[PDB]
Design a protein around this ligand. Sequence first.
Ligand SMILES: C/C=C/CC/C=C\CC/C=C/CCCCCCC(=O)OC[C@H](COP(=O)(O)OCCN)OC(=O)CCCCCCC/C=C/C/C=C\CCC
Ligand SMILES: CC(C)CC[C@@H](O)[C@](C)(O)[C@H]1CC[C@@]2(O)C3=CC(=O)[C@@H]4C[C@@H](O)[C@@H](O)C[C@]4(C)[C@H]3CC[C@]12C
Lengths: 236, 241
Amino acid sequence: VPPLTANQKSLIARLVWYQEGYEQPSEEDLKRVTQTWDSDMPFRQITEMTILTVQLIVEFAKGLPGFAKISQSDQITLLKACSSEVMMLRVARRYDAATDSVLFANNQAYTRDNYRKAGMAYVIEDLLHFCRCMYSMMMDNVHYALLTAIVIFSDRPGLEQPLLVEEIQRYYLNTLRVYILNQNSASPRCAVIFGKILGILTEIRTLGMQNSNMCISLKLKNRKLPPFLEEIWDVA
Amino acid sequence: VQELSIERLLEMESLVADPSEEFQFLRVGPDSNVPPKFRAPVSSLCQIGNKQIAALVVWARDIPHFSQLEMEDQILLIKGSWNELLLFAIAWRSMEFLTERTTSPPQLMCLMPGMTLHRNSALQAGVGQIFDRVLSELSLKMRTLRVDQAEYVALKAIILLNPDVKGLKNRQEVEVLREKMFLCLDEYCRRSRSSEEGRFAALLLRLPALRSISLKSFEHLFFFHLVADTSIAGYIRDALR
Ligand SMILES: C/C=C/CC/C=C\CC/C=C/CCCCCCC(=O)OC[C@H](COP(=O)(O)OCCN)OC(=O)CCCCCCC/C=C/C/C=C\CCC
Ligand SMILES: CC(C)CC[C@@H](O)[C@](C)(O)[C@H]1CC[C@@]2(O)C3=CC(=O)[C@@H]4C[C@@H](O)[C@@H](O)C[C@]4(C)[C@H]3CC[C@]12C
């Protein structure tokens, strides 16, 4: 029934900070892309907003303890695989159950119908189901921040110092254990919570492949997927 | 009725399937573009695959409370985990043939007692990476973890008992069955290996590595029209009676 070291809380603190630090893209960036007072419009916004999301996700990843201890080779490896899966945790946080839609950083609500129009009709029914499941999950910003971190040092194929990352991860994995162990009576349910959360990992893997298939079924429809995204997700 | 516990389960792993019904979830479709000199073997492989599926289809159903949940769901839960289950069993069996400036990639993948798959063959089938992922991320990494039968059949039940599967008439009816399992497992680690800082997580962290591999193995299966896609629910349904 222990508490947490100083590091831990400094990290949790730190992570909760960077998270709000990066939830949305800057007012200027946001302003620049959203400028404007035909199926390329929803498409432009969704794609353009995603490029901002990824960027934020990347910078957050570097503000992570232990990240700079990774080979540039691995860093681009971890980041490259996490880019799409964290972006998933982040669409959950801006989901609104009342309307069953996702809210973009410009305060606009995108429905399953908008994603249709933009030709993303494939990715939406599943993305929105994951949101309903993350909703009833009812998680706090610590979880989310910790979870994120974890996903990033999640074992990925192509890793040079695999064993290294595993521990860089064992830490965050461990911190989360503790924080859950305090937030409630270190009783039975304490694991049940730790488990459902770690379960998010596997679902996030399925939505990751769907994002890729969407990038594929989009290059194939000859539709310019931003080079930036095509590159980071290894979209052939 | 009995309590869903690691105990009852281990008494189900040993249970033998009833190869009475021939259900082809996997097969060489006439519309398959699999070379001709390999239709006999690839077909033969599918047939093995099939037994096992029906073998887990009848294990799933003999799980504490599983048969109670509404069948429609029951179908969907199975329909949604067989590949994963199928692959996990392979990784388990493969642990044996594990060879574990010193090490090279494993060369054997045990499909069923006795019979095995050699690396170079998967290499000829263009499934060498996925083959490699199965033996590294799963079999090897497990050996390392020294996971035992109690942990292994637990994970299994957990894999099958997924509430996130889309379309569940009553999600929470599954969440209970899962949450029970989350407990049974946590204590088992407590009781049987309390010296392990983070085992509970290391075991549950195989679940994603597994999901990805299974997700990939579907692409390959589909590129070859190997899966009886539209007809699986039925066999699942049909067989669940
Ligand atoms: C989840 C598993 C469920 C049930 C398990 C078993 C049933 C599924 C079938 C899996 C076959 C495993 C590969 C072994 C192939 C053996 C035949 C061989 O040597 O073919 C060479 C041929 C060269 O011609 P090719 O056309 O010229 O060249 C190939 C393309 N470069 O290759 C072919 O004919 C390719 C056949 C396609 C086989 C299906 C591949 C999907 C398997 C991935 C699933 C993971 C489990 C198995 C891991 C080994
Ligand atoms: C192929 C690729 C383009 C598809 C990605 C699509 O399927 C996703 C997952 O659906 C994309 C589309 C646009 C999207 O990038 C976003 C817009 C925002 O406004 C914000 C910007 C920033 O605050 C993020 O922290 C959250 C959010 C809501 C992201 C989340 C992921 C979204 C919702």
